[PDB]
């Protein structure tokens, strides 16, 4: 009963503004990443941005 209730609950409800939710869920972490390819010194691997 617990598992069935939880599964029937976890479903995207009609009317959700999923596009804006996802847009903000991608943009918001994007404001914290540096405008630089920071990496741990001492490796000198291939250069990729």
């Amino acid at each position: 009963e617990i598992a069935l209730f939880k599964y029937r609950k976890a479903r995207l409800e009609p009317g959700t503004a999923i596009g804006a939710i996802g847009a903000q869920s991608i943009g918001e972490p994007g404001t914290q990443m540096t405008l630089k390819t920071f990496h741990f010194a001492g490796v000198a691997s291939m250069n990729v941005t």
Binding site: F38, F40, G42, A44
Partner: protein, 54 residues
């Protein structure tokens, strides 16, 4: 090949400890959002290779 040896190491716990047992991690203190706010430290699991920040 790469030289993960001679890289900064600390003593932390991976978020997914129940999968891989990570008692060490590489780090750099090279992220500072604001001056009043404290610094930020990025890690990576020396065992599995999971990057995260604090």
């Amino acid at each position: 090949g790469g030289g993960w040896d001679n890289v900064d190491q600390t003593k932390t716990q991976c978020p997914n400890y129940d999968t891989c047992g990570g008692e060490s991690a590489y780090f750099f203190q090279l992220q500072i959002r604001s001056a009043d706010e404290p610094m930020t430290t990025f890690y990576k699991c020396v065992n599995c290779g999971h990057r995260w920040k604090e």
